[PDB]
Structures are given as structure tokens and as C-alpha cells.
Design a binder for this molecule. Sequence first.
Ligand code: CYC
Ligand code: CYC
Ligand code: CYC
Ligand code: CYC
Ligand code: CYC
Ligand code: CYC
Ligand code: CYC
Ligand code: CYC
Ligand code: CYC
Ligand code: CYC
Ligand code: CYC
Ligand code: CYC
Ligand code: CYC
Lengths: 172, 172, 274, 162, 162, 162, 193
Amino acid sequence: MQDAFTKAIVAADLRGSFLSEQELNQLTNLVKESNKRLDAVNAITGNAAEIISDAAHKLFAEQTDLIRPGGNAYPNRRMAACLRDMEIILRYVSYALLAGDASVLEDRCLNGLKETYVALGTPTRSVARAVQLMKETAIGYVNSPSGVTRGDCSALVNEAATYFDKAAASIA
Amino acid sequence: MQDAFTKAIVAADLRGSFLSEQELNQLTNLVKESNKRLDAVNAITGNAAEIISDAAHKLFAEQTDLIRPGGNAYPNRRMAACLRDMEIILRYVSYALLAGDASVLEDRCLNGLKETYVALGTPTRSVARAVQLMKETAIGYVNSPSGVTRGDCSALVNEAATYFDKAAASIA
Amino acid sequence: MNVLTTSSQRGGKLFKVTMTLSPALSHHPWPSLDTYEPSQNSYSVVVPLDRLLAEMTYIKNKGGRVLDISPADLEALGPPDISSVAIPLKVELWAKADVSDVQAAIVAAYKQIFGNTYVLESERLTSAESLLRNGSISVREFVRLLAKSELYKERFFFCTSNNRFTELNFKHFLGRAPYNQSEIAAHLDRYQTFGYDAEIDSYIDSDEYIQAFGENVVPYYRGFKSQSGQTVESFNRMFKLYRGDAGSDTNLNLQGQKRRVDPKNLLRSGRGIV
Amino acid sequence: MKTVITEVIASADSQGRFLNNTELQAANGRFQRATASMEAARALTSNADSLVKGAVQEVYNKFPYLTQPGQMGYGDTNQAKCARDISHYLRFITYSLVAGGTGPLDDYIVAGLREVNRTFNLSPSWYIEALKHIKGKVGSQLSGQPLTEANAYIDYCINALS
Amino acid sequence: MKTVITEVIASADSQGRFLNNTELQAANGRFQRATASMEAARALTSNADSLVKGAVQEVYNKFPYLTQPGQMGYGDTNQAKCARDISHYLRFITYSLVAGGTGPLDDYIVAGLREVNRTFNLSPSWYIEALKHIKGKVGSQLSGQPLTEANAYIDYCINALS
Amino acid sequence: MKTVITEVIASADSQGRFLNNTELQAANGRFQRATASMEAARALTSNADSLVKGAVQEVYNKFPYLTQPGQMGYGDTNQAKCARDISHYLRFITYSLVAGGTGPLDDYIVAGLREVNRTFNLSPSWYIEALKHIKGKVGSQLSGQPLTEANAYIDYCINALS
Amino acid sequence: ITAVAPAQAVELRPNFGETELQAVIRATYKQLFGNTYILEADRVVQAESLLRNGSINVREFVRLLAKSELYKERFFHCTSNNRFIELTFKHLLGRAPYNQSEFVEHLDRYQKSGYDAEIDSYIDSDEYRRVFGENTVPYFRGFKYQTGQAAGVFERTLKLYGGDADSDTNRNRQGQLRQVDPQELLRSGRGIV
Ligand SMILES: CCC1=C(C)/C(=C/C2=NC(=C\c3[nH]c(/C=C4\NC(=O)[C@H](C)[C@H]4CC)c(C)c3CCC(=O)O)/C(CCC(=O)O)=C2C)NC1=O
Ligand SMILES: CCC1=C(C)/C(=C/C2=NC(=C\c3[nH]c(/C=C4\NC(=O)[C@H](C)[C@H]4CC)c(C)c3CCC(=O)O)/C(CCC(=O)O)=C2C)NC1=O
Ligand SMILES: CCC1=C(C)/C(=C/C2=NC(=C\c3[nH]c(/C=C4\NC(=O)[C@H](C)[C@H]4CC)c(C)c3CCC(=O)O)/C(CCC(=O)O)=C2C)NC1=O
Ligand SMILES: CCC1=C(C)/C(=C/C2=NC(=C\c3[nH]c(/C=C4\NC(=O)[C@H](C)[C@H]4CC)c(C)c3CCC(=O)O)/C(CCC(=O)O)=C2C)NC1=O
Ligand SMILES: CCC1=C(C)/C(=C/C2=NC(=C\c3[nH]c(/C=C4\NC(=O)[C@H](C)[C@H]4CC)c(C)c3CCC(=O)O)/C(CCC(=O)O)=C2C)NC1=O
Ligand SMILES: CCC1=C(C)/C(=C/C2=NC(=C\c3[nH]c(/C=C4\NC(=O)[C@H](C)[C@H]4CC)c(C)c3CCC(=O)O)/C(CCC(=O)O)=C2C)NC1=O
Ligand SMILES: CCC1=C(C)/C(=C/C2=NC(=C\c3[nH]c(/C=C4\NC(=O)[C@H](C)[C@H]4CC)c(C)c3CCC(=O)O)/C(CCC(=O)O)=C2C)NC1=O
Ligand SMILES: CCC1=C(C)/C(=C/C2=NC(=C\c3[nH]c(/C=C4\NC(=O)[C@H](C)[C@H]4CC)c(C)c3CCC(=O)O)/C(CCC(=O)O)=C2C)NC1=O
Ligand SMILES: CCC1=C(C)/C(=C/C2=NC(=C\c3[nH]c(/C=C4\NC(=O)[C@H](C)[C@H]4CC)c(C)c3CCC(=O)O)/C(CCC(=O)O)=C2C)NC1=O
Ligand SMILES: CCC1=C(C)/C(=C/C2=NC(=C\c3[nH]c(/C=C4\NC(=O)[C@H](C)[C@H]4CC)c(C)c3CCC(=O)O)/C(CCC(=O)O)=C2C)NC1=O
Ligand SMILES: CCC1=C(C)/C(=C/C2=NC(=C\c3[nH]c(/C=C4\NC(=O)[C@H](C)[C@H]4CC)c(C)c3CCC(=O)O)/C(CCC(=O)O)=C2C)NC1=O
Ligand SMILES: CCC1=C(C)/C(=C/C2=NC(=C\c3[nH]c(/C=C4\NC(=O)[C@H](C)[C@H]4CC)c(C)c3CCC(=O)O)/C(CCC(=O)O)=C2C)NC1=O
Ligand SMILES: CCC1=C(C)/C(=C/C2=NC(=C\c3[nH]c(/C=C4\NC(=O)[C@H](C)[C@H]4CC)c(C)c3CCC(=O)O)/C(CCC(=O)O)=C2C)NC1=O
């Protein structure tokens, strides 16, 4: 598994080199913003259930076919599987966010996922949408939390978004 | 598994109580001395091989019967087992030292150990001695290391000793 | 064990493996004789890199045969995107060509006929292109000229079996996969008694070819769309045949020019005689 | 019992390995963090009495019907066992604060929670609402990293109950 | 690759669990400790080569028969491959410093070490002595927690070779 | 303890099976071979004294520096423990000769070898050189199939140490 | 009574129903954790989801459960390393250990390669593969003479199997101890392995 430092190290090694002063300071900056990062990961963990629930309510509000017989979130067994997948993806997105690298998300979650869903008959476009809704709400929480020091978290909100967007793209 | 805090918590709970101001400050002191504790655990880790080796050289210097045929550290297979056990015990002593509690040592290492050795015909008094030698050298290292800030580590040296002494007592 | 998710746990490179097992690995717990499930005749399992050497050794011993090893992450990105080629862009050469109208045709015939392999500039058929430019020959005529060339003979024929050649031929010349086992056989017997050249002519003078391409249209993909007298399973063969925009026919593969359409698969569409 | 210390030791042991710089760095986090944690702990400890009575009442104010006869917020014994239960939660929150991890919560409240609540007809909604209220008031007893810690664990209980 | 961040994530994942206050406290340790680590890294980075030539020579001075003909410290190629190898070690030490764990050392030097050294007739003693020397000189390039870090990883290599 | 006899019995037992012609043919090999083996054994047995002193010295002649002060070929105790160790090897070689397999070598010298040698700073190179020398001299004590047997086992030890 | 073990393994007969899958999941938890209650919150929902999707076999599901932190807390952190090895033989292989050599090899592997490599060593064993395969849940075997056994395994597996109401439960005041004697373990073999 990689994190943002480990990634630097692998690229340096492929040159046969000690880390460039370029790469050093990029990593010094990651340490600089790490308290914000911890709050951002904490924002997701602290509202995981609601993020999934709210995404869910809204997914089925839009796509009332999934909860009809014939639909891929019917009966209870399938809805529980769908709720479970929403949690799994939100979980690996939070891991990537602590790590500063998408690899755990791509390697443990996204790799093969689309082909799984197609084999199952699970409508990937609906799954992509559920991921887009989790993103909206998750970032909502990253931006408006309990008595965190005021500052600018937009860099981290972007990065979190790209992890949500990776997952969506990979699946649709 | 317990650490020194977890131990406090279990005793508090058995009263049905929030931690006593007594117990709170005992734990505040453990946090106070924690940098020293980290150096002490680091002293052992950083010299593990030599601690085992030096204990070993000296054990067989004293007890030349173990390395004769008929002896419990003969042939190579048995010596490797004996060297391995020295490492295992030094390892759980270092864990206890990071934790501030003996439980991991007693539960994962010392529990049943004497009866194992007796079943095997392994002379427990010799094993106890090997543990006493590891203690001497380990503490040596805890007390005289590379450019650590000067201060008093005797409290921690005692506590490390009791973990070595627990193991010895339990085994002999 | 089948089609996978993820790659690694601590970290790995997962490889998925495929074998053919004896009742030595897997058997039912029944009263007699040891048998594995008939549908797990060739079974596949995904193993992280360390357990991999140990697994292959075990499988080979207790009797199995490894059929493949391929990284899991290669195999997770699906099947090709086919949007560029579901419905292509047709290129056709007009009566009085414009000087670069004709430039368009040559680049495309190359790409399509040679199956997207690079044709380097030393390599191009210049005298033949001269002919098309002056109108002495037409686009279909030119298309036949490339096929009988050494460059075509060399990257696609000389180094692979006849099964493969014919399967490539259908893809290049006709744009569609090969529908039947009979098609393969009918062709192999022709090559054997009339030679390579007669056999090449047989796709370019065919009725199927003539309808769709006529004579001034560069052969273009057409097997991702329903056609006539096409078995239904020839639309899955097309995925096996074309591997994406960046894929190509390539004879430079480490393993060499090989198949792509399983012989077993062809028989599913019907077996007769001759 | 899950703490940063027990976790790194568990991970070392399971690979048959001495603690190394990775594991000691981790431990330093837990020790550096103790001050904020333990401030939250002391504030939650001395306000316990009122935090509990505040949350108990809020369960009845949000679910008015509970306090009518024939219901589970009626009579001395139900209302007594309620205060006790919220008190259990606050107690384990302080323990988790002091311990440097969720262990006390995981072992004494989370493991088994749903089975128990389901057999005894206890709705999680009450408990979430008790905790939401406790979270509101703890906004003005603490601030900075002690508040973040208090929040971390209160929210952890709310997610355990959803 | 073992870092505080990867370790806590691994532990969460393996229990199917979101990161909680235990795991985020741990991460803060790694981030709080980056400054000392990265100062050690910069000092070790700029004062580099000579460490290799110093240690290479010391292997021959301590094992004189080494630099004699017919021996493995003789001729340009042996002496070249030696400098390179110590340079590999220092390189991975800096990586381990920057990464927040032993991962780079574990994955690129420790995994397989003995098999390789045994097939190629390379004695660990040389490498330990190279590292003991590097440890002596790093005593005056750094101090405080940067020195402790440098030491942690140098010693880690010496234990890997014993 | 691995011998032809124990191996075939192990293989029968593990298939729940009486010994059959396959297994008895195997045993005949071991019995037919005993004469050459046991001649090697008797020659190695009576020359033991000098084979050991010859190999011990050769370790010092090939690694001259070992015999200087501060080194591991210096003083009565090192040089005593060396003779003993080569004597252990020759002893187990004779046992393996007599036993009809590598068992005695596998169980008493090979299992654990590297761990022990690594903890005690014993270089395999010495031991290989002791054995290479013993192999040189055994060229003129034996010939034919007794020499081949002696060689088989000496070489087996040298491969165990590489 | 150990009426119940003669055994009859349960499995994923290609084309399993959700009821048969839930019976397999309940059987794997009863085997790996004994008669100990597991809260629904403590279940490895990720590993159950992978088995529901057919993406893992019953062997790999047993591997994920034995590597879970719940198994470490109950059996590894609460017992001695020798008692842990006895219980891992009980849970994964359905037998007692054959000789004092198996303990030394497993103790040495655990010390060299850690917890996860020690769990993999039982599951990748040719004994696990030969007798459970990929699709059979682990089950108690020590009541049948098995090929290449040691008669003392029957008595030791009886000592390890206190019956269908017993708990390898880690709370029994004393807590996690040992149950097969070292002296009695030594009869059957003892070697300078
Ligand atoms: C237990 C693990 C752990 C956490 C969670 C942690 C958080 C943490 N967040 C901090 C700051 C902060 N955190 C934020 C975060 C935000 N600002 C906003 O306006 C957004 C709504 C939000 C975006 C994510 C900001 C702006 C600061 C102050 C600037 C800084 O220190 O970087 C600080 C510095 C002290 C302070 O200023 O309060 C800490 C210690 N430390 C830890 O050890
Ligand atoms: C990577 C994990 C980690 C370690 C190892 C660590 C060590 C560490 N040891 C420290 C102090 C110290 N460490 C010692 C230790 C000793 N004094 C002696 O004379 C004895 C030989 C030895 C006994 C163990 C002393 C006396 C101090 C200064 C007093 C104190 O800060 O408590 C300090 C405070 C800064 C300083 O004064 O240098 C740190 C950060 N911090 C960490 O994050
Ligand atoms: C799900 C239930 C199920 C079925 C149906 C099944 C079929 C099956 N038949 C097999 C072999 C076999 N099947 C046959 C059958 C025949 N040979 C002939 O010539 C006849 C035409 C025919 C008998 C009518 C033979 C001879 C083999 C052994 C092939 C070999 O190993 O060479 C094997 C390979 C494993 C083994 O040999 O045990 C499977 C899996 N396995 C199953 O688990
Ligand atoms: C069978 C072998 C063969 C021959 C011999 C051949 C001749 C030939 N020369 C052509 C054109 C041409 N040939 C020339 C040659 C010349 N221009 C001058 O002023 C000079 C007097 C002379 C050079 C010495 C030019 C300029 C054109 C292009 C005419 C145009 O497109 O306007 C064309 C029209 C097609 C094309 O442009 O490629 C043909 C077919 N083609 C063949 O396949
Ligand atoms: C690259 C050079 C090349 C080879 C080697 C080749 C082999 C080959 N042999 C084939 C058929 C065949 N091959 C045989 C051969 C035999 N039948 C027997 O019973 C005997 C054991 C054996 C003769 C010794 C038969 C009978 C068929 C027809 C099978 C059928 O259609 O049922 C086919 C299917 C196409 C066709 O029938 O024309 C190919 C591709 N094709 C090639 O292009
Ligand atoms: C051998 C004779 C033959 C068959 C049977 C055949 C089936 C066939 N149906 C196709 C598409 C299709 N088939 C349907 C059919 C349906 N959509 C629905 O929702 C209904 C349930 C169902 C109508 C009852 C649709 C909608 C597509 C287009 C799928 C797409 O492009 O998204 C395609 C892809 C190529 C194309 O779109 O032309 C094939 C090959 N092709 C053949 O050559
Ligand atoms: C859809 C657009 C498209 C792409 C992207 C494409 C890639 C592509 N690159 C190829 C070969 C190649 N690609 C390279 C590239 C490289 N060699 C190196 O060492 C470097 C690392 C790298 C250059 C940066 C080489 C050397 C070959 C020839 C391999 C061979 O034949 O041995 C081939 C095989 C066919 C051929 O050789 O023409 C394809 C299909 N083809 C396409 O149609
Ligand atoms: C160590 C941690 C721990 C927790 C958290 C815990 C919860 C818990 N609550 C219980 C009962 C109860 N819990 C309540 C709760 C409430 N009643 C109200 O007025 C409110 C609606 C609500 C408070 C918000 C009630 C009324 C009962 C009695 C249920 C019964 O026996 O009918 C019981 C059943 C045993 C008993 O009757 O005491 C348990 C185990 N037990 C524990 O050991
Ligand atoms: C990525 C981390 C990494 C390490 C650590 C590494 C060590 C390493 N050292 C090697 C050789 C070598 N290593 C040395 C070492 C020395 N010679 C001397 O003068 C001194 C005594 C000593 C330095 C202290 C020598 C002489 C060789 C050549 C061995 C041979 O091929 O005969 C080789 C064999 C391949 C080769 O010949 O380069 C490896 C793999 N390789 C790696 O990839
Ligand atoms: C049953 C089979 C068996 C073998 C093979 C064996 C080897 C062996 N050699 C040892 C020590 C030793 N081995 C030597 C070897 C040598 N010193 C020299 O002068 C030469 C360089 C070299 C001989 C070639 C030395 C010097 C020691 C003492 C190491 C120490 O304790 O510092 C020890 C450590 C216990 C002890 O000090 O006796 C073992 C176990 N032990 C066994 O039980
Ligand atoms: C064969 C069918 C079967 C039975 C009957 C069975 C009993 C059984 N009860 C156990 C624990 C338990 N049983 C209880 C039961 C009670 N506590 C009380 O105070 C009450 C008096 C009583 C409820 C009426 C408790 C509290 C434990 C947990 C003990 C502990 O871990 O501290 C355990 C230890 C394993 C575990 O905790 O899951 C077993 C094996 N297991 C089985 O497989
Ligand atoms: C590594 C962490 C991890 C992930 C991410 C994961 C995904 C995953 N989702 C699955 C099923 C599923 N996933 C869904 C999800 C959805 N259905 C919809 O219509 C929506 C678009 C979407 C919810 C937003 C459904 C309905 C199934 C069941 C498909 C079926 O069995 O028919 C399965 C098959 C196994 C099972 O059903 O338990 C896997 C492995 N598994 C994992 O272990
Ligand atoms: C929980 C952590 C843990 C410990 C502590 C442990 C001890 C332990 N030591 C053992 C053997 C051994 N232990 C020794 C140790 C010694 N011999 C001596 O003469 C000296 C006095 C002493 C070294 C100081 C020896 C020689 C054996 C092998 C006995 C034999 O097989 O004959 C065995 C038998 C299994 C095996 O040989 O691998 C265990 C279980 N196992 C564990 O898993």
C-alpha cells in the first residue's frame, strides 16, 4: 500500500536517487496541512452513517425503479448489499484521504468492481450516482463541522472529491 | 490486552465509577515520563541482537554442560530453539515496557511456560539464568545510550527489571 | 475465485490463475470415486504474489495444469470501449480525386487493413499508391494489393497458423468475426489446394464484401452491429478480436501471433461436415 | 482493549517482531494527545451529574409520549434505569478519552448492543438523542482539541447506534 | 509500505471499519514528528558520499586481507560495488526517515538479504562495520530527535544483519 | 531420522499401506550400499584425530588473520572449540555413512545452522574450507564407491553452508 | 457425549441457496469461536459480503476470520503461546497436535514471521487441503482414526473438546491456560528437532 510519502520514495528509487529538494518540500507541505487532513478524515468518520443514509434516501428518491420488484435494490437482502457497498466505498475514500494517495482505493476497492457489477446485473450508473451523492454530503461535512478552527480546507475538499470522482468514473 | 491506562479503567469500572483524581494523576505522570519510556523501549530494540548474543555467550560460559552432547542446547537445532526463546522473552519484556503493564508478558509468554519446559526436559534454572543475563545487559543499554538527553531513568530501569524478574520467577 | 474485485491486501500484486484439476485438489465428499464438479473443469483463483510460487507448485504436483497467469489489475479494467468503432466513419474515394482526398484514403486503408500496427516509412507500398492516385486502380483494388504484399504476408501469415490467419483476414478484410467452424475449414482447404493467392481473393471477391464496401469504400468495422446470417455469438467474438483503440494486430508479442478465438467457442455455433 | 499502545504491540507480536520506529512514532501520538483527551475527561467527569439529567430529560422532551402511563419512560424504575444507562455511556466516553482509543466503548457498550436493545425493546433513537444533547452542552464546557476529542467519542457512540 | 498512516489504515480495513479517534491520534504523532525526521533527512541528504568512501575503506582497514589481491576488496569493481551498496543503505535510511517507518528498508533491503549475501559470499560483518562507522560520524552532523531518528534506522539495519 | 528405510516406511504409512515391491527394492539399495559406506566410515573414524587437526590448521592458513590477538582463531578456547566443531562434522558424516542417509546431518547440524552461526559470528567460509581440506586428504584414504560416499556427504555439508 | 463429532462437513455445493450460505456462515463462526456468543456488531460483515458474492471460497473466508482482530483479542491476547497453538490446531485442523516438534516449529515460525504467517501455515497445509479442500467448513476429526495418526491424538482431542457446552472462552477466572500436558505431549515422539 502507498501513501503520499511512499509514492515519492518509489519514484525517487526508480531514478536511483535520494529524494529531490523538489519532492522534499512537497512532503513538508503535506505535514504542514496534516491537522486539517485529520479533521477532514474525522469529518467523514463522525458522520459515516448519515452520509450513507442521506445518500441512500436521495438515490431512491430519484430512481424509484430500484425499489420496485425487478429492481436491483429489492428485496431487503439486495438493499442491505447496496447499503453495504455504499459504506465500503465511503470507507476506502476516507482511507485514501488519510493517506494522501488513491492507491488503497484503486487496489482494494475499484479494481474489478465494474465487472463484478455487470456480472451481477447491478446498474452501474445508479451506483455511480450513489457515489456522487455521498461526495456532496461528505464534503458538506468536511466544510461545516463542530468547533474546528476557522481556515481554508478547499485543497483537501478537492482532493477528497477526486477520490469520490475516481470511484464514480471507475464504476459507471 | 492491558496497558497501564486500561488497567486503571478496569479497576474503576469494577467500582462503577469515573476515574478517581487519585488514578487520573498517576496516569498524568505516566504521560509525563513517556519520552523517557520511548527511549527505554528503543534502547532494547536497538540492541536486541547483542542483548541476546551477549546473554548467550555468558550462559554457556557458565554452564558448559548445555553444549555437550546430553545437554539441552545441543545440537544446532536445540541451540537455535534456545536462542529463539531468548528473543521471544526479550520481545514480550519490551512490549510490557511500552505498555506500562506486565499483562502481555504474563498472558502471551509466561502462562504455561514452566510446564512446557518441564515436559520438554529443558532445565528451567538455566532458562531463568539466561533471563537474568538479558536483564543485566538490557538495563545496561537503557542506562548508557547514544546522545539521549541526560536525566534519571531509574524508575523505568526498575520497572523493566521487574518484568525480567517476573519472567525469571515464573520459569525457574 | 472467478471474476475478481480489488488487487491487494497488505499489498500485493494479485494474479489470477487458471488450471485444470484433478480430483486431488477438490472432490465431493461422497461415497465413491473422487470427482470434481463438472463445471469447474478449469478453475481460476486469484493469489497475491507471495503465495503464488507455492500455489503453482502445489497445483502442478497434485496433477493440475496451469493454463494461465495474468495480473489481476490488467483484468479488472473490463472489455474494450467500442464507441469509436460501433459505427465508424466511412472513407470513400471519389472519381476525380482532390490530391489530399486520396491522402485520406491511404492512411485509412493502412490502419484498417494492417490492423493498426505501425507501417514505417521505409515500409509503405509506394508504387502501388502511385496507381491509386492516377485512378488506374480503385480503392478495393488497392486493398487487394496490400494483402498480397510481403509486409502483409510477413506480419500475419508466415509466423502464425492458418487458423489465425483466417481469423485475422475476416477482421481486416471484412470487418467482422468468423461465424462458423465451417468458415475456418472452408478456407483452410482452399489455401491448401490453390495457394495463398487464390485464398486471398476469396474475401475480396465475395458477395458479402461487395455489398458493404462496394468498390470505393475502405473496409471498415461492422461486426459490432447486427449483420445478416451471422450467428449470435459472433458479436462476442468481435470483443475477442478487437482489443480497443490502442490494441493492434502485432506480431511482436512475446508469446507470438496466436488465435484469440478459442476453437471450442467456434463449435458452439454449429458443427456439420466438410 | 483497543488503545494506540495495544494496537501497535498487537501488530508487532503478530509478526514476531520487536517494536520499531513506526510503532514508537505511533505511541508518541497517543502520549502527545493525552493532555487534550484528559482535559475533556475531567470536564465530562465533574459535569456528569447534570449532563446525565439534561440528556435524560431531553429523551422525554423529544419523545413526549414516553412519559405517559403504560410507556417506557414512566415510573421510577424506567426513569432510574435510563439515567443509569446514559451515565454508563458518559462513563465509557471518559474511559475512552483517558485510554487513548475506543476500546472501552467497543468492549463494554458496542459489543452486543443491538441484541440487548432489541430483546429489551430499547430504541436507539432515544440514546442518539441523549448523546446529541450531551454534544450540544459539551460545546461550552470545552474548546479546541479537548472538544474535538469529546466529539470524536460522542459521535462514535452515535454511529454505533445507527 | 510500512508508515504510521498505512499501519492504522491497514488495521481499520482489516476490521471493516472507518478510521476512529484511536487511529487519527496515531496519525497526528507521525505528522507532529515530521519536522525532526525531515531535518535529519536534509542533513543526511547533503552530507552523503564521503560517508560511503569512509565506510568502504574501513571495511578494508578492519579486514586487511580484503584489499590484498585474490580478495573481495580488490580491484575497481569490488570497491565500486561496495560504495554502491553502502549508498543503497544510506538511501533507504533516508527513505525510511522521510516515510515514517521501516517499510523502505523492509521491502528493498531486508526482504531477501541473507539469501543474497550467502550466494554472493558477502559477510554481514562488513556491512555492520560500515554502519557502525556511519553511526559514529552522524553523531556530530545531528543532535536531539533528528539524531535519535538517524540512530533508530541505522541500528535497525545492524539488527537485520545480525 | 532420514534413512532409505525410514523414508520408504514413512511413505507407506502415510498412504495406510503395507510395504510393497517398490519399497523393498529401495531398501535393497541401502543394504547393497552398506559395504562401501561402512568402509568410508571406518577410514574416517580412525583418521579422525588427524583429519580434524589438518582441517583446523587449514582454516588458519587460509584465514591467516584469524590467529592474531582480538580475533576468533586466538587463545586456547576458540582453537579448542574449533577442533571440536570440525570433529562434530566428521562425526555426523560417519553417522550419515553408517545410517544410509543424511538424517544425522539434517537433524544435528543442518537444522538451525545459520541461526546459530549468525548469533555467534561464525563464518561458514571457515567450515567450508575445513571440509574442502578434509575432502582433499580423503582422496588417498579411500577410492571407488567408499570415496564417492565420503564425497557425497562432505559435499552435502558444503552445500548446507552455502 | 461426543455424539456430535462424527462429523459431516457442510459446504457450498456449487449453486448454493442463501439459506445454505447462512448455515455455512453460522457453522464457520461456531467452529472458529466455539460456543461463544458473537454480537452482530462484532461480525466481519466485509468477509460475509465477499462470500455472498462468491468472490472468496470457504478456505479464504476462514483465513479472513482467523486473521480478524476479534480472533486475536479472544485467543491470542488472553492465552499463553502454547495454549494459542493448541486452540489453533483445534479450530482450523479439528485435531490435537501430534508431537512436541509441531509446537516448536509453530512457535519458531510465529517468532520469525509473526501472527498472519502462522495462521496461513495451518490453512496452506497439505492436511487442510487434503481433508477440507476449498468449500468445506472446519470440523472435529480426533474421534476417527485417521491415516498416519498417533493413537494419543484421540485422548488429547478429547481433553481439548470439553463437549458441546464448553467454551474456549477466555474468562474462566484463571483465564486462558493449557489443557494437554507437556509430559503427556512428549510421549509421542520427542526429538531434537
Ligand atoms: C485526533 C487526531 C487529530 C485531529 C483531528 C487534530 C486536529 C487539529 N486541527 C487543527 C487546526 C485546524 N483544522 C482546521 C480545519 C478546518 N477549518 C475549517 O474552516 C474547515 C471547516 C476545516 C477543514 C478540514 C483549520 C482551518 C485549522 C487551523 C489551521 C491549522 O492548524 O492548520 C489543529 C491545530 C490546533 C488548532 O488550531 O486547533 C489540530 C491539533 N489533531 C489531531 O491530533
Ligand atoms: C520515536 C519515538 C520517540 C522517542 C524515543 C522520543 C524520545 C525523547 N526523549 C526525550 C527526553 C529524554 N529522554 C531521556 C532518557 C534518558 N536519560 C538518561 O540519562 C538515560 C540514559 C535515558 C533513560 C531512558 C531523558 C533524561 C530526557 C529529558 C527529560 C524528559 O524529556 O523527560 C524527548 C524530549 C526532547 C529532549 O529533551 O530531547 C523526546 C522527544 N520521542 C519520541 O517520539
Ligand atoms: C456435479 C456432479 C458431477 C458430474 C456429472 C461430474 C463429472 C466428471 N466426470 C469426470 C471424469 C470422467 N467421466 C468419465 C465418464 C465416461 N467415460 C466414458 O467413456 C463414457 C462415455 C462416460 C460414462 C458414461 C470418465 C471415463 C472420466 C475420467 C476421465 C479421465 O480421467 O481420463 C470428472 C473429472 C474428475 C474425476 O475424474 O473425478 C468430473 C468433474 N463431476 C461431478 O462432480
Ligand atoms: C508500373 C510502374 C509505374 C509507373 C512508371 C507509374 C507512373 C505514374 N506517374 C504518375 C504521376 C506523375 N509522374 C510525374 C513525373 C514527371 N514529371 C515531370 O515533369 C517529369 C518530366 C517526370 C519525372 C521525370 C509527375 C509530376 C506526376 C504527377 C502528375 C500530377 O498528379 O499532376 C502516375 C499517377 C499516379 C500517381 O501520381 O501516383 C502514375 C501511375 N506508376 C506506376 O505504377
Ligand atoms: C498451419 C498449417 C495448418 C494445419 C496443421 C491445420 C490443421 C487443421 N486441421 C483441421 C481439420 C481436420 N484435421 C483432420 C486430421 C485428422 N483426422 C484424423 O482422424 C487423423 C488422426 C488426422 C490425420 C492424420 C480431420 C479429420 C479434420 C476435420 C475435422 C472436422 O471438420 O470434423 C482444421 C480445421 C479447418 C479445416 O478443416 O480445414 C485445421 C485448421 N490447418 C492449417 O492451416
Ligand atoms: C443472430 C440474430 C441476431 C440477434 C438475436 C441479435 C441480437 C443483438 N441485439 C443487440 C442490441 C439490442 N437489443 C435490444 C433489445 C431489447 N431491449 C430491451 O429493453 C428489450 C428487453 C429487448 C427487446 C425485446 C436493445 C435495446 C439493444 C441495443 C443495446 C444498446 O446498444 O444499448 C445487438 C448489438 C448490435 C446491435 O445493436 O445491432 C445484437 C447482436 N443480433 C443478431 O444478429
Ligand atoms: C490507439 C493509439 C495506439 C497506441 C498508444 C498504440 C501502442 C502500441 N505500441 C506498440 C509497440 C511499441 N511501443 C513501443 C514503445 C516504447 N518502447 C520503449 O522502450 C519505451 C518505454 C516506449 C516509448 C516511450 C515499442 C518499442 C514498441 C515495439 C515493440 C516490439 O515490436 O518489440 C504496438 C504494437 C504494434 C506496433 O508495433 O505498431 C501498439 C498497438 N497503438 C495504437 O494504435
Ligand atoms: C455497561 C454498559 C451497559 C448498557 C449501556 C446497558 C443497557 C441496558 N439497559 C437495560 C434496561 C433498560 N433501559 C431503559 C432505558 C430507558 N428508559 C427510559 O425511560 C428511557 C426511554 C431510556 C433511557 C434513554 C429501560 C426503561 C430499561 C428497563 C427495560 C426492562 O427491563 O424492561 C438493560 C437490561 C438489564 C436491566 O434491566 O438493567 C441493559 C443491559 N447495560 C449495560 O451493562
Ligand atoms: C536495493 C538494495 C540492494 C543491496 C543492498 C544489494 C547488494 C548486492 N551486492 C552485490 C554484490 C557485491 N557486493 C560487494 C560488496 C563489497 N565489496 C567490497 O569491496 C566490500 C567488502 C563490500 C562493501 C562493504 C561485492 C564485492 C560484490 C560483487 C560480488 C560478486 O558478484 O562477486 C549484489 C549482486 C549483484 C551485483 O553483482 O551487483 C547485490 C544484489 N543489491 C541491492 O539491490
Ligand atoms: C552438534 C553439532 C554442533 C555444531 C556444529 C555446533 C557449533 C557451535 N560452535 C559454537 C561456538 C564456536 N565455534 C567456534 C569456531 C571456530 N573458532 C576458530 O578458531 C575457528 C575459526 C572455528 C573452527 C573452524 C568458536 C571460536 C566458538 C566460540 C564462539 C563464542 O562463544 O564466542 C557454538 C556455541 C556454543 C559454544 O560456545 O560451544 C555452537 C553451538 N554446536 C553443535 O552442537
Ligand atoms: C451447545 C450450545 C451452547 C451453550 C449452552 C453455550 C454456553 C456458553 N456460554 C458462554 C458464555 C456466557 N454465558 C453467559 C450467561 C449468563 N450470564 C449470566 O449472568 C446469567 C446467569 C446467564 C444467562 C441466563 C455469560 C454472561 C457469558 C459470557 C461470560 C464471559 O465471557 O465473561 C460460553 C463461552 C463462549 C462465549 O462466550 O460465546 C459458552 C460455550 N455455548 C454453546 O455452544
Ligand atoms: C472492498 C470493500 C467492498 C466493496 C465496495 C464490495 C462491493 C460488492 N458489492 C456487491 C453486491 C451488490 N452491490 C449492490 C449495490 C448497488 N445496487 C444498486 O442498484 C445501486 C446502484 C448500488 C448501491 C448504491 C447490490 C444491489 C449488490 C447485490 C447484487 C446481487 O447479488 O444481485 C458484492 C458481491 C458480494 C455481496 O453481495 O456481498 C461485492 C463484493 N465488496 C467489498 O468487500
Ligand atoms: C509464546 C512465546 C513462546 C515461548 C516462550 C515458547 C517456548 C518453547 N520453547 C520450546 C523449545 C526449546 N526451548 C529451548 C530453550 C533452551 N534450551 C536450553 O538449554 C536453555 C536453558 C534454553 C535457552 C535459554 C530448547 C533447547 C528447546 C527445544 C527442546 C527440544 O526439542 O528438545 C518449545 C517447543 C516448540 C519448539 O521447539 O519450537 C516452545 C513452545 N514457544 C512460544 O511460542
